[PDB]
RNA sequence: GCAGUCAAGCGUUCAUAGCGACAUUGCUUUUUGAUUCUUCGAUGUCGGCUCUUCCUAUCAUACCGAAGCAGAAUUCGGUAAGCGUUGGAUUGUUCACCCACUAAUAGGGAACGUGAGCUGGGUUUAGACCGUCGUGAGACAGGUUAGUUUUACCCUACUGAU
């Protein structure tokens, strides 16, 4: 998703350890008779995705199926 | 899922505890009140030293956990992990609503979100019992579950000795006669009243007048 | 909580005589003279005998009295001034250019010009005060003496020229290059 | 020609300080307190860093 | 959304140059909810074009302080809103996304600025087609085609003029 996103083809791509809640993520790229490896940083950013932001706000489900029988006995 | 703690600070609420009618409740977050040395007499430690709220507050069940975790970490580092013995008092039992949710106030009562204290003016959160030299960083290890709370707290020298209901020098004048007896954590007393027979059992110190 | 009476002691010498009316204070000796308005202060002078003088302070809170103690301190400086002077030493500090200073004059003003600090194009001047007298020491390489009556005047003359010679847009760890006050003193020997 | 004498000099001026944390002002070595007052006079200060 | 406080892990040694989890204390009304006080003898209901002004929570431009600042190239913070912040491909779009120039392509407000200032692509009358639904009349906030934008000469304001 990230290479996808960088704005020749490539030989390779890995990626280095940034740490667990240091928002930054870093990877390496590989790339006709010259071959060159660099390095790429990815700033993290943090927001809402919709979904769960409608989780707060009461209509939640969106469609309902009410099943009812007028019995007291259900077969 | 955790709500900010200002919402549900004050006691507006009635007690609303689990029962058969709320049934379902989710786990408390503190789990274990006793830490240290737990297994100690009460020869080993005297000096005893509270931390007293100054306010009628809840604390919830995550701000006792933070707390509790702080105190117990610079206790550990600095005096060694068997110099003391802390335990919480505040049991948080409190249940906690939030309406998580055809229209708005169309049908609109709330799902149980989480456990609470309801803490009152004077009374002992935090109880550490512990040697007369080792006071400084029993004093600085409270210091920083204060932060962790809301309102105002503060940290009090005990007079009385250890957990005991006694003064200093009144469980001195006891103990030195055979009137004092180790039960296993806390202490047993002589009583002048009850049978005879089973005062003489137990307490053999006592009944003597030599040493 | 306001103090009842507070006072420090002026120890004249045998040499100069100090003149105070208002606050106005003249002190002449042997050097030449010098002058200072302490109408901002709110204290009372007092002669006793000659070579000693009180200065006090009356229902004074403690600001109040901490101002006492330094208007002791400007006219014990008066005096030292006027008898012995002072005298403060800078030295030029470098790697590759050397800092090349000389007075040169404008308008009947005098000014120290500083040229080639670091590889600069910007001549940098810096206008001598009133009183005081700059001499480039001989036999003591890149050093620079100036000298007067007027500490104020000196040290300030002297600051200028420390902050006439700052490096941008380096790492002033590195880049350790100036002209700093190396030596404050007197011109009199012995005291 | 660093000198030992006009780097100590020097380094007097330069390097020999502290700094407040919160407002990055550059103090006096032996200070409590910064001096500014929009950090409320914190004493929460630390000393220069070195070069190599 | 924005800000502290405490600081877990990181940052080869090293808590606090700098990244920064979770807690705990706030501000905002540029988001969305909650409510129904005002308006149903009607306050023109999207966006764009045009044009003034204000906010700073400053992208650039001036002067500074810090750095795990040799230099170059950067990163963090202070005073500051004085001065600027673009041309295009696709979409009715706001938003989004790309190409290109640039010192910089910062964020917001003013009845979600502005229809007797325009436009009318969009939404939201009547015609008409499809799909699913319904026995049927017909429904669809699903897709698609065509569809009237009225009045200043009054008082005030602004601009000029006796
Ligand atoms: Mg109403
Ligand atoms: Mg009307
Ligand atoms: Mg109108
Ligand atoms: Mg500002
Ligand atoms: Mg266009
Ligand atoms: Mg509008
Ligand atoms: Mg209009
Ligand atoms: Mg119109
Ligand atoms: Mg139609
Ligand atoms: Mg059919
Ligand atoms: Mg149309």
Redesign the pocket.
Known sequence: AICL?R?VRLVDASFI????????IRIKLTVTIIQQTFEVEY??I???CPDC??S????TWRATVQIRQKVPHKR | ??R???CY?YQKNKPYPKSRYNRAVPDSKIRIYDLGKKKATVDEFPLCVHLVSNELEQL?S??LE??RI?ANKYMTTVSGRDAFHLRVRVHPFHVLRINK?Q????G?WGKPHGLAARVDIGQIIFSVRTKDSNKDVVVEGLR?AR?????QQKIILSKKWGFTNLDRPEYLKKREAGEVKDDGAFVKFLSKKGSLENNIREFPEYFAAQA | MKYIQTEQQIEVPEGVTVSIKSRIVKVVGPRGTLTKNLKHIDVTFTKVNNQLIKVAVHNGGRKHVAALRTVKSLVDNMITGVTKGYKYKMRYVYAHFPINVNIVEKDGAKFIEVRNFLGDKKIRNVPVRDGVTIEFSTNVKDEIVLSGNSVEDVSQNAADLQQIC?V????????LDGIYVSHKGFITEDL | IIEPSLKALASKYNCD?S?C??????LPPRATNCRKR?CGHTN?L?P?????
């Open positions: 996103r704005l350890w940034t740490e667990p809640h240091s928002r930054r700033i993290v943090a927001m809402q932001a409608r707060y706000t009461t209509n | 899922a955790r900010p703690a200002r600070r919830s995550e701000a933070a707390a702080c949710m229209q708005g106030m169309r609109a920083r932060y962790k709370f809301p309102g | 700052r941008r847009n380096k790492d002033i760890r590195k880049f | 300080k700094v944390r919160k407002c990055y002002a550059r929009k929460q630390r220069k860093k070195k070069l190599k």
